[PDB]
Amino acid sequence: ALGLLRTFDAGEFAGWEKVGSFGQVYKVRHVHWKTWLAIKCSPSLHVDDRERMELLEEAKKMEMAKFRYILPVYGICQEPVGLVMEYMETGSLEKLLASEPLPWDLRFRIVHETAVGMNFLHCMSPPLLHLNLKPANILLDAHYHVKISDFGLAKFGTIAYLPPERIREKSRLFDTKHDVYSFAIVIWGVLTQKKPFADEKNILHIMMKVVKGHRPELPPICRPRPRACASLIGLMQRCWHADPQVRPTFQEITSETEDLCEK
Ligand SMILES: Cc1cc(Nc2cc(N3CCN(C)CC3)nc(Sc3ccc(NC(=O)C4CC4)cc3)n2)[nH]n1
Ligand SMILES: [Cl-]
């Protein structure tokens, strides 16, 4: 796993340029390779042995899940201590959702592609749980194709993506149904181009209500694609069901999201 990863000295990089902010991420040019890469640096003053080993474990999990819809990893830098990855020109889904209204065919393709990447992770032996999926992690290339990132918590404003069973049970064991819930909240963001619970001031009250089956407000059926929109709303609702075992698998999810992209 960690054998094929390279070590980068910072002299190989140039034109450092912020994109993140967690840990500052930079678009860097590799001068010899004549292409761009992304480097996530440490957020601290001194990077001890815990970080170095965590950053390595994060790298190795990315290499383990090498796939079309998963962000590629190249290696670790030591000069500044950072993780060296593929650069994606368009950036996060969060930024894209805030920038302008997106055509529905693209919305459906983003959801499908995200679902296919998540399904890949869950098909691994053993399954790889993402556990941090949100629009800030979902990256888009120059032609708006998805690659999933952020494997730092794999095995703040993130309360909205947290399953209700994680609020009910102190230290429940993580499972595939955690990711399925988060994916539902990702769908809601694609449907509305809004952030979930943006209006609400009482963070705790909403968390308590969520344990009883409270969710982001259902959007209306859209005009341009009312059948597919209705179908996606329904799928979203099953994916955010209060009972984890009623929620669909990503095998079942991908079958359905694929049909939304047909025609
Ligand atoms: C890791 C990574 C990041 C990128 N590319 C980009 C590019 C980008 N921008 C594209 C250009 N516009 C003008 C501004 C936004 N904005 C982000 S915002 C962003 C920052 C970091 C992460 N993910 C991580 O932190 C990875 C390490 C786990 C996702 C999105 N990420 N390629 N690879
Ligand atoms: Cl339709």
Swiss-Prot record:
Post-translational modification: May be phosphorylated by MAP3K2 and MAP3K3. Proteolytically cleaved by during Fas-induced apoptosis.
Active site: N132
Disulphide bridges, residue numbers: none
Gene Ontology cellular component terms for the protein in this record: cytoplasm; cytosol; intracellular membrane-bounded organelle; plasma membrane
Gene Ontology MF annotations: ATP binding; protein serine kinase activity; protein serine/threonine kinase activity
Disruption phenotype: Conditional skin knockouts in embryos show significantly thicker skin and aberrant skin stratification with Krt14 expression extending into the suprabasal layers throughout the epidermis. Adults show a similarly thickened epidermis, with expansion of the spinous layer and basal cells independent of proliferation rate. 60% of adults develop spontaneous facial tumors when aged.
UniProt note on tissues of expression: Expressed in the epidermis of the skin (at protein level). Ubiquitously expressed, with an abundant expression in the thymus, bone marrow, pro-B, pre-B and immature B cells and a weak expression in the spleen.
Cross-link Glycyl lysine isopeptide (Lys-Gly) (interchain with G-Cter in ubiquitin), sequence positions: K40, K134
Cell compartments where the protein resides: Cytoplasm; Membrane
Keywords: ANK repeat, ATP-binding, Cytoplasm, Isopeptide bond, Kinase, Membrane, Nucleotide-binding, Phosphoprotein, Receptor, Repeat, Serine/threonine-protein kinase, Transferase, Ubl conjugation
Region forming the signal peptide: none
A biological process from GO: morphogenesis of an epithelium
Binding positions (ATP): V19, G20, S21, F22, G23, Q24, V25, K40
Domain Protein kinase, residue spans: 13-260
Family: Belongs to the protein kinase superfamily. TKL Ser/Thr protein kinase family.
Subunit structure: Interacts with PRKCB. Interacts with TRAF1, TRAF2, TRAF3 and TRAF5. Interacts with BIRC2/c-IAP1, BIRC3/c-IAP2 and XIAP/BIRC4.
Additional detail: May act as a tumor suppressor in the epidermis when exposed to dermal carcinogenic agents.
Free-text function comment from the UniProt entry: Serine/threonine protein kinase. Required for embryonic skin development and correct skin homeostasis in adults, via phosphorylation of PKP1 and subsequent promotion of keratinocyte differentiation and cell adhesion. It is a direct transcriptional target of TP63. Plays a role in NF-kappa-B activation.
Protein name according to UniProt: Receptor-interacting serine/threonine-protein kinase 4
Organism: Mus musculus
